[PDB]
Design a protein around this ligand. Structure first.
Ligand code: NAG
Ligand code: ZN
Ligand code: ZN
Ligand code: ZN
Lengths: 210, 221, 267
């Protein structure tokens, strides 16, 4: 029933005033929708934040506010703190049927930007003997935690066999991630150069081989 | 205080029947409804259905043909029963309390359970094949050579990568597993100084408890 | 003539229940601050002035009469019963009657509301097999708006019918806005029903019902209620009056027309 849509991710810094938004395919978000704002913290431990559009749930700090801003519902963190980093889910009621949004990832810049260390690894003789080749590209120590990995073969762009792990926090709080390109030894032989293109903060850092 | 716990199978094969339980405490089922929300890996939340305090239920249009919520008011248990399970169903399963305010008249999901992970796989416990990862293209850039170790196709999780049995700790980066085919592949990389490799041996150790196998694999240049 | 009181009401020998800040009816319905009077018993129940309600705004038509019937019975013994409401949300409550962490209501009443999409046509029946009368207390809720009426009971206008083999009360809610009390413009109206042995209480409704949780055991009217701000003292005295204790030694008293116990005749 309908499709609730919201920002993929939003990146604020401490103090700034962010406002996540919640749209409805079927139209404007009215009070009839009881916009619910759930907050997902690390390792999926959900917590209610606002109910019925603007009713602040008990634990929730004063700084979170529910409201309608035009034809979409919104939540506004006023004076975001590092401890607000989380996936903020929006849920909209449509006649005894709930409809959640995609969720918004909120980053709260708490440390200096760090560039990923990219590493492309070629298939191991061993793995090749059994007629399969898996390119391993390890992207690490990046901050903030968001990269886009793209594969290229002989300059042309890859669209199969690639799988990229979602980024994971590190102990030093920077980030690590990884991507794999899986082809059969035969297909691995079929080309000369292979590249992993890591795109983070506008720039793209790529590693390649042959 | 309110409190909801989900106890379920953990692992069920495609074409079997999934049955999770949400044991509520600190409120009665005749006073509140309980909702079911699932979160498939790296996706958004999905609303499965709901059982009202009157017993009647309201299910998610899509999954409705296979879902089925019930409850035993006397035991404080809400039951989510799914049939004709298919892989896609691997996801975290959550039950959350349905709240309604009588003075302002609005619905809300206040108490969320802890959740319970359910994987739908037809795979037998299989140990990981471990291939060593060396640079290959010696650009001689800087003093930090980086080695890796692929842990291909095992099941179920988790595996335990270690380098030199723990000797190497500085920058051991061990990424999360992925799901190629139907088994979990994963990798880990340790970085060392060029004046350490190939000079000294840097070994990769992979213990996989579920299948009592423990492979070590020395990474050669 | 006896024309003077000590000024106090002696605690002995009649079991005198001071309601402090609860009147009988509030203690009966179970206003959160009269939770102490549960299952209490008395010969004489003195209602003070302090007395204030502090729960969902309600009115009791035939108040002075329902009040007296209970007061005489002298017990407040409530007996829970297995009422079976299938199709509606029970235990409803409100902020104008908080309890514990939040929303509350009268302990002896059960607010039913719609279960999601609907409010079925309730129709429970409860037989009195016992050897004593049952005093069921219920009520009807009058929302102040067609919005409230429909959010809660779905149906655009509800109805409550509480029949026994010989009676039949069919009260239909009346939507509209009454004066604000504890933030509400809404009201509930308290009704009652006594069920004689071998009779069957029958509640059928399809809206606004404020259902009974059980019954009150009724003994014989030997006890009585009295309004007085008189202090209570530890002493033995037989004739009690709103003004206090007066001796029953003289045959005519002129102190007050209201008295309890072997008392001089009023003049
Ligand atoms: C009132 O009486 C019933 C009698 O069966 C009992 O279940 C209930 O706990 C009593 N409550 C108090 C406060 O005495
Ligand atoms: Zn080519
Ligand atoms: Zn590192
Ligand atoms: Zn006496």
């Amino acid at each position: 029933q309908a499709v609730v849509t919201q920002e993929s991710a939003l990146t604020t810094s401490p103090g700034e005033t962010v406002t996540l938004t919640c749209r409805s395919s079927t139209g404007a978000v009215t009070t009839s929708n009881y916009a619910n704002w759930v907050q997902e913290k690390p390792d999926h431990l959900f917590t209610g934040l606002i109910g019925g559009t603007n009713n602040r749930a008990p634990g929730v700090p004063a700084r979170f506010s529910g409201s309608l801003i035009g034809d979409k519902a919104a939540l506004t963190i006023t004076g975001a703190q590092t401890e607000d980093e989380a996936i903020y889910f929006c849920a909209l009621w449509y006649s005894n049927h709930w409809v959640f949004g995609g969720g918004t990832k909120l980053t709260v810049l708490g440390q200096p930007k760090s560039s990923p260390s990219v590493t492309l690894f070629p298939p191991s003789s061993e793995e090749l003997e059994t007629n399969k080749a898996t390119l391993v590209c390890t992207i690490t120590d990046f901050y903030p935690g968001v990269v886009t990995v793209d594969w290229k073969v002989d300059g042309t762009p890859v669209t199969q066999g690639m799988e990229t792990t979602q980024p994971s926090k590190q102990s030093n709080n920077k980030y690590m991630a990884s991507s794999y390109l899986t082809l059969t030894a035969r297909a691995w032989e079929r080309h000369s150069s292979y590249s992993c293109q890591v795109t983070h903060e506008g720039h793209t850092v790529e590693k390649s081989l042959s | 205080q309110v409190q909801l716990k989900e106890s379920g199978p953990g692992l069920v094969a495609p074409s079997q029947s999934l049955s999770i339980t949400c044991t509520v405490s600190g409120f009665l089922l005749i006073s509140n409804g309980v909702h079911w929300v699932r979160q498939p890996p790296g996706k958004g939340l999905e609303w499965l259905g709901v059982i009202w305090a009157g017993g009647n239920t309201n299910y998610n249009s899509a999954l409705m043909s296979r879902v089925s919520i019930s409850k035993d008011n006397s035991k404080s248990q809400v039951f989510l029963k799914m049939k004709s399970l298919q892989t896609d169903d691997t996801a975290m399963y959550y039950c959350a309390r349905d709240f309604y305010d009588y003075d302002v008249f609005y619905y809300a999901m206040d108490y969320w359970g802890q959740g319970t992970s359910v994987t739908v796989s037809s795979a037998k416990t299989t140990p990981p094949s471990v291939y060593p990862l060396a640079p290959g293209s010696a650009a001689q850039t800087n003093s930090m050579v980086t080695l890796g170790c692929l842990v291909k196709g095992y099941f179920p999780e988790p595996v335990t990568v270690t380098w030199n049995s723990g000797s190497l700790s500085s920058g051991v980066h061990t990424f999360p597993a992925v799901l190629q085919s139907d088994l979990y592949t994963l990798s880990s990389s340790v970085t060392v100084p060029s004046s350490t490799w190939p000079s000294e041996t840097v070994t990769c150790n992979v213990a996989h408890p579920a299948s009592s196998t423990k492979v070590d694999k020395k990474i050669v240049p | 003539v006896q024309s003077s009181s000590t000024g106090k009401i002696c605690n002995n020998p009649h079991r005198i229940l001071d309601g402090i800040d609860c009147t009988l009816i509030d203690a009966l319905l179970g206003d959160p601050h009269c939770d102490v009077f549960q299952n209490e018993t008395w010969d004489l129940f003195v209602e003070r002035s302090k007395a204030f309600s502090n729960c969902y705004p309600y009115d009791v038509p035939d108040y002075a009469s329902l009040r007296s019937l209970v007061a005489s019975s002298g017990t407040l013994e409530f007996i829970t019963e297995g009422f079976t409401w299938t199709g509606v949300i029970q235990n409803g409550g409100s902020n104008a009657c908080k309890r514990g962490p939040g929303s509350g209501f009268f302990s002896r009443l059960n607010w039913l509301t719609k279960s999601g999409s609907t409010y079925p046509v309730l129709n429970v029946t409860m037989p009195n097999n016992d050897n004593f009368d049952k005093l069921y207390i219920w009520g009807i809720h009058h929302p102040s708006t067609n919005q409230e009426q429909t959010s809660l009971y779905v149906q655009a206008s509800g109805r409550v019918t509480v029949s026994t083999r010989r009676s039949q009360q069919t009260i239909i809610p009346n939507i509209g806005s009454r004066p604000w009390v504890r933030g509400l413009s809404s009201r509930i109206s308290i009704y009652w029903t006594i069920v004689k042995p071998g009779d069957v209480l029958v509640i059928n409704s399809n809206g606004n019902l404020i259902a009974p949780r059980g019954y009150f055991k009724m003994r014989t009217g030997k006890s009585s209620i009295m309004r007085s701000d008189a202090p209570i003292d530890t002493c033995i005295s037989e004739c009690i009056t709103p003004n206090g204790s007066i001796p029953n030694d003289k045959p005519f008293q002129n102190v007050n027309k209201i008295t309890y116990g072997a008392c001089p005749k009023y003049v």
